[PDB]
Design a protein around this ligand. Structure first.
Ligand code: 3TE
Ligand code: ZN
Length: 292
């Protein structure tokens, strides 16, 4: 009774091009941006937090109340970690193709780098589960003046603590600090989207950070779930208690292990989309390289 004829990338592609598959939800994380030269900010082994701030504890750099009273460490770190270029990956442009072809219901992302937007996903297509640098707001509840990334970038590089032009309050990028809630939009969209989904495409996430990881359990029981990731992820934790790729009871979950770009390339090829994807990426990359 299962929807995939076989538990392979080939099976997923046949399903995608069948009448049964109309709405795809993508769940994406840091693994879709590493090939764009953006490291994984949640990892301690990427050396981003290797080093004067006098933090009452090392975690305070991520905490909202600390930020509000001592914003300088955050903004110094933001300058240090600011990417040299913003060129979305093959994986990002694969999602743009999903959008173009009327298959994209939603992209839920853990990333803050804005590459989904640069690749042409719109606000309505996105749930930025950990917020984004794309916009920043004055922290004063009575004001909330919104500032674009161009404005915020200028403040970060000039090492001027960003203050609101209307009220002189601190201006904070719309990323979710420890102590802040996840965006309201995350919960709203989750409630509706997973009633409507035909395929989950899970790319570049290890599914270890909650509540993002729990999204896979919101899929209907029949909905195929394809993981494209360097490592297998999402199975039940044998210590406590999921994806089932390999047991005799597996029926809908498929793992393609490798670089996300290569997995998306392989899937696009099966779909007859490889030329379209190559043409889109090369054109967009050229346009970004040519920014004058
Ligand atoms: C600075 C910048 C600007 C743009 C457009 N894109 C990037 S992507 C590269 C990157 O990893 N950067 C980062 N900026 C801040 C980081 C740590 C951090 C600290 C405190 C709170 C956090 C709240 C939520 C998330 C992280 C938080 S990592 N980086
Ligand atoms: Zn203000």
């Amino acid at each position: 009774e299962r929807l995939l004829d076989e538990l392979t990338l080939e099976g997923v592609a046949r399903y995608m091009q069948s009448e049964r598959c109309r709405r795809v939800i993508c769940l994406v994380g840091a693994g879709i941006s590493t090939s764009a030269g953006i490291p994984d900010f949640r990892s301690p082994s990427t050396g981003l937090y290797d080093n004067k701030y006098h933090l009452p504890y090392p975690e305070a750099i991520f905490e909202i109340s600390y930020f509000k009273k001592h914003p300088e460490p955050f903004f110094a770190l933001a300058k240090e970690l600011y990417p040299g270029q913003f060129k979305p990956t093959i994986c990002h442009y694969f999602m743009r193709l999903l959008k173009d072809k009327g298959l994209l219901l939603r992209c839920y992302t853990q990333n803050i780098d804005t590459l989904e937007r640069i690749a042409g996903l719109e606000q309505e297509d996105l749930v930025e589960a950990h917020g984004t640098f794309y916009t920043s707001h004055c922290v004063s509840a009575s004001c909330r003046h919104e500032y674009p990334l161009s404005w915020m970038k200028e403040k970060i590089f000039s090492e001027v603590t960003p203050k609101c032009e209307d009220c002189q309050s601190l201006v904070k990028p719309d990323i979710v600090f420890f102590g802040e809630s996840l965006p309201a939009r995350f919960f709203s969209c989750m409630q509706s989207d997973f009633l409507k989904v035909d395929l989950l495409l899970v790319m570049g996430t290890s599914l270890q950070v909650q509540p993002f990881a729990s999204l896979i359990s919101k899929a209907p029981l029949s909905t195929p779930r394809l993981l494209i990731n360097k490592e297998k992820a999402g199975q039940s934790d044998p210590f406590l208690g999921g994806m089932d790729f390999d047991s005799k009871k597996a029926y809908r979950d498929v793992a393609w292990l490798g670089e996300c770009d290569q997995g998306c390339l392989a899937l696009a090829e099966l779909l007859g989309w490889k030329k379209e994807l190559e043409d889109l990426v090369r054109r967009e990359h050229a346009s970004i390289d040519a920014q004058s």
